[PDB]
Amino acid sequence: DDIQQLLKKINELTGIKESDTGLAPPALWDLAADKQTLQSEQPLQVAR
């Protein structure tokens, strides 16, 4: 019983970790232009 309880203890405490989103390496970022596109360009729904 203690072995099972400790196993669940480790499982809940070990966590999740990343969960690392698709972030490009720096110096490839044009955050200014990215914001410009966000505030300027618009999405389009596709259709048949």
Choice between 21 and 45, CB closer to another protein: 45
In the region spanning residues 8 to 47, those forming contacts with another protein, defined by CB under 8 A, are 32-33, 36, 39-43, 45
Give CA–CA dist 25/19, Å, rounded. Answer: 16
> Per the structure block, which two tokens stand in for 9?
């203890």
Give CA–CA dist 33/29, Å, rounded. Answer: 9
Q: Does 48 bind another protein (CB under 8 A)?
A: no
Q: In this structure, what DSSP letter does residue 35 have?
A: H
| Cβ at position 40, least distance to another protein in Å | 5
Interface residues with another protein (CB under 8 A) are 32-33, 36, 39-43, 45
